Amino acid sequence: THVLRFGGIFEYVESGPMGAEELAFRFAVNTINRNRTLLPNTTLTYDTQKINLYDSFEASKKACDQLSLGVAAIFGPSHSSSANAVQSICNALGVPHIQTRWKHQVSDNKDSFYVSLYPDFSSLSRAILDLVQFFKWKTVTVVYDDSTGLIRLQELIKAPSRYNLRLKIRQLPADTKDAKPLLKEMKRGKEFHVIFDCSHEMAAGILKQALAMGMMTEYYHYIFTTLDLFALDVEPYRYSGVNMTGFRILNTENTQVSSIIEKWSMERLQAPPKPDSGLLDGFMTTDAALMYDAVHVVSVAVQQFPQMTVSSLQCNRHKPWRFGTRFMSLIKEAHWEGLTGRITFNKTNGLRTDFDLDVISLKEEGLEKIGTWDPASGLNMTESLSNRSLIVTTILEEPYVLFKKSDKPLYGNDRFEGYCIDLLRELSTILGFTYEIRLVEDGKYGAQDDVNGQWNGMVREL
Amino acid sequence: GVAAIFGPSHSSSANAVQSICNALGVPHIQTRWKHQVSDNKDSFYVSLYPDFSSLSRAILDLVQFFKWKTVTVVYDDSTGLIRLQELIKAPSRYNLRLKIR
Ligand SMILES: *[C@@H]1O[C@H](CO)[C@@H](O)[C@H](O)[C@H]1NC(C)=O
């Protein structure tokens, strides 16, 4: 059988023996060759190196060392800076490159030897806009971890030009977790709708600090554009009363996906996640799922490309790789499906813009799925009585409605008294009424506001 | 035989050359604005283009001095919003009506 090794450049760490992306790559590599369903007459192999993800020169060195040997494909690092150098090297030598974590793509860079399994942030931003349209919001507060968040989410920022929205963008300071000034500023603006554009670890941390600030009220609504929001411990938030909504691509509601996540949680028993950090345990991180799907679709493409003789392309001198064109084409229209649901590549760019999304909202139960988002269909939100309570609202005027003048605190509908109260009593004893008296929360009459026509009291209560 | 480097005027190319120069120790004296990743730990380099933090807040100073109420920012491509961050965050602390196009 054919033997091919996929050049891998993953994170170098010292606390954990090997990085989660490295675990995903190794697991999928040993799974594909083991399972004769994929690659029956071809044996898998790999070549994993370690970089700091910032010294792009050393990443280039590792990539050059890999290409000096036979490499089937390059699975570039998950950094927003070093990946550019690796993809440039791959394009120069005509070798396929498969990113997994999103990076900014220079619109003036004409490189056709790279793909990005991470859903394109333009599509995700459009989905966020569609969801906010479904929520009819007016005041929003977008927050980002890195400055790249502005690039990641721009469609919603432009939206107030298209629609009647309003934005107030604030930044999470670096090298700190002091969200308290940011949250205090949020209260000073009464920004009940807030969007958190940060990774799931930072999202969980800032959620913990918000709960410690008592930000889990019903009035506050949260959206987390990250795809690992499901992996947060919603146990303190199951009864917090938040209407939080989020997105998901890991199609956990599948037998094969459940088996894979269970096996992966079994494998990662060496470095358990810290329980006292607001993070769940035994779950598939979205980046690992993307790496899994990326290597699987590469395997699917090379299934249709049996002639996969590798070479020893150098960096001291450059030479085009003869198998790049058609193999990368097969990569581009490799329509395989896995943990992230549907996987396909927009042939115009290579960034996946057509992908399933699990719309996730928070209720009493933990992170229910309230529908599905698709690029073609936009947002797909689908989801008298004899013993009917007769709720009424009334204002306390002594000639009309006065509380029962009893020293003992009276309960039930008997505590209410007056002309209107007894008139309602007569209506209930004449007609069929399950009468109950509820005091008006506004305490004032319906006033025609010149600002927005906002009523109050009985009018806006009805 | 070199003792200094003047990198290209571009994000990715200058980033790569800066990393190479840091590894080799020679300075990489870039002359064009680029977005350094906030967690970058490189030293041997310097940029002369006015960083869009003092210049962005200078645009903010112009906005306040002109006393605008309805500002409509317009940019060129993705790496422009990441560059005028202070102007984007200004409406939180003041009265602005950014409708970005
Ligand atoms: C939308 O979701 C519903 C179930 O929630 C499903 O029956 C339907 O096929 C989906 N698509 C469309 C276009 O309605």
DSSP of A32-64, one letter per residue?
A: HHHSTTS-TTEEEEEEEEEE-SS-HHHHHHHHH
Residue A365: alpha-carbon gap to chain centroid? 19
Residue the block writes with tokens 């041997």? B44
Which distant-in-sequence residues (6+ apart) come within 8 Å of B18 by Cβ? B7, B28, B30, B42, B45
CA torsion A126-A223-A252-A20 (nearest 10°) is 100
Query: In this complex, do B92 and A189 lie within 8 Å of one another by their Cβ atoms?
Result: yes
Provide the β-strand partners of residue B30. B47
Question: What single DSSP character describes residue A135?
Answer: H
Question: What single DSSP character describes residue A242?
Answer: -
Q: Are B15 and B35 in contact (CB under 8 A)?
A: no
Token pair listed for A39:
């690659």
Question: What single DSSP character describes residue A11?
Answer: E
Of A102, A272, A269, nearest to A197 by C-alpha is A102
Helix (H) or strand (E) holding A351: none
Which distant-in-sequence residues (6+ apart) come within 8 Å of A426 by Cβ? none
By CA distance, what is B82's nearest residue in A? A150
Looking at residue B38, its amino acid is S
Decide: A377 in ligand 1 pocket, CB within 6 A: yes
Q: Give long-range contacts, CB 8 A cutoff, 24+ apart: A153-156.
A: A153/A121, A153/A124, A153/A125, A153/A128, A153/A195, A153/A197, A153/A225, A154/A122, A154/A125, A154/B78, A154/B81, A155/A122, A155/A125, A155/A126, A155/A128, A155/A129, A156/A125, A156/A128, A156/A129, A156/A132, A156/A195
Provide the β-strand partners of residue A7. A47, A74
Give dist(CA A149, CA B91) in Å, integer: 18
Helix (H) and strand (E) counts in chain A: 14, 19
Atom of ligand 1 nearest to the CA of A371: 5
Residue A161 is nearest to which of B38, B81, B100, comparing CB atoms? Answer: B100
Give dist(CA A311, CA A121) in Å, integer: 35
CA torsion A364-A367-A368-A374 (nearest 10°) is 150
- C-alpha angle A311-A313-A317 in degrees, rounded to nearest 5: 155
Which distant-in-sequence residues (6+ apart) come within 8 Å of A379 by Cβ? A127, A130, A131, A133, A134, A359, A371, A373
Q: Are A150 and B85 in contact (CB under 8 A)?
A: yes
Q: Are A312 and A345 in contact (CB under 8 A)?
A: no
Give dist(CA A179, CA A141) in Å, integer: 14
Give dist(CA A355, CA A61) in Å, integer: 34
Out of A134, A372, A374, A379, mutate this one to test ligand 1's pocket (max ligand atoms within 8 Å of CB): namely A372
Using CA atoms, how far residue A156 sits from A142, A306, A370, A392, B99, in Å, is 9, 45, 22, 41, 11
Residue the block writes with tokens 């283009």? B49
Residue A157 is nearest to which of B41, B72, B100, comparing CB atoms? Answer: B100
Of A226, A239, A180, nearest to A206 by C-alpha is A180
Token pair listed for B57:
């807040």
Q: Chain B residues with CB-CB distance to A under 8 A? A: 10-12, 15-16, 19-20, 22-23, 35, 37-42, 72, 77-79, 81-82, 85, 88-89, 91-92, 98-101
Of A97, A101, A106, nearest to A117 by C-alpha is A101
* Count of beta carbons in the 10 Å neighbourhood of residue A457: 18
**HSE toward the beta carbon, residue A351, CA cutoff 13 A:** 17
Question: What single DSSP character describes residue A174?
Answer: T
Give dist(CA A21, CA A15) in Å, integer: 15
Q: What one-character-per-residue DSSP string does A68-94 give? A: HS--SEEE--S-TTHHHHHHHHHHHTT
Using CA atoms, how far residue B42 sits from A54, A55, A79, A278, B99, in Å, is 9, 8, 15, 33, 36
Of A30, A68, A31, nearest to A49 by C-alpha is A68
Q: For A271-283, b where at least 16 C-beta lie within 10 A, e where not — what string?
A: eeeeeeebbbeeb
Q: For A313-330, b where at least 16 C-beta lie within 10 A, e where not — what string?
A: beeeeeeebebbeebbeb
By CA distance, what is A189's nearest residue in B? B92
Q: What one-character-per-residue DSSP string does A390-404 give? A: EEEEE---TTT-EE-
Of A349, A393, A361, A370, nearest to A102 by C-alpha is A349
Query: In this complex, do B16 and A57 lie within 8 Å of one another by their Cβ atoms?
Result: yes
Cβ-based contacts of A140 with chain B (< 8 Å): none
Q: Chain A residues with CB-CB distance to B under 8 A? A: 54-58, 60, 79-82, 84-85, 88, 104, 106-109, 146-148, 150-151, 154, 157-158, 160-161, 167-171, 174, 185, 189
Q: Are A95 and A71 in contact (CB under 8 A)?
A: yes
Strands (E), A78-229: 98-99, 115-116, 142-144, 170-171, 193-197, 221-224
Give dist(CA A135, CA B19) in Å, integer: 45
Distance A170 CA to ligand 1 centre (A): 36
Distance A124 CA to ligand 1 centre (A): 20
Q: What's phi and psi for A148, nearest 5 deg?
A: -65, -15
Give dist(CA A239, CA A317) in Å, integer: 63
Q: Are A356 and A249 in contact (CB under 8 A)?
A: yes
Atom of ligand 1 nearest to the CA of A377: 13
Query: In this complex, do A54 and B35 lie within 8 Å of one another by their Cβ atoms?
Result: no
Looking at residue A94, its amino acid is G
**HSE toward the beta carbon, residue A399, CA cutoff 13 A:** 0
Helix (H) or strand (E) holding A57: helix A56-68
Q: What's phi and psi for A99, nearest 5 deg?
A: -70, 160
Experimental method: cryo-EM
Helix axes A82-92, B11-24, angle to 10 degrees: 100
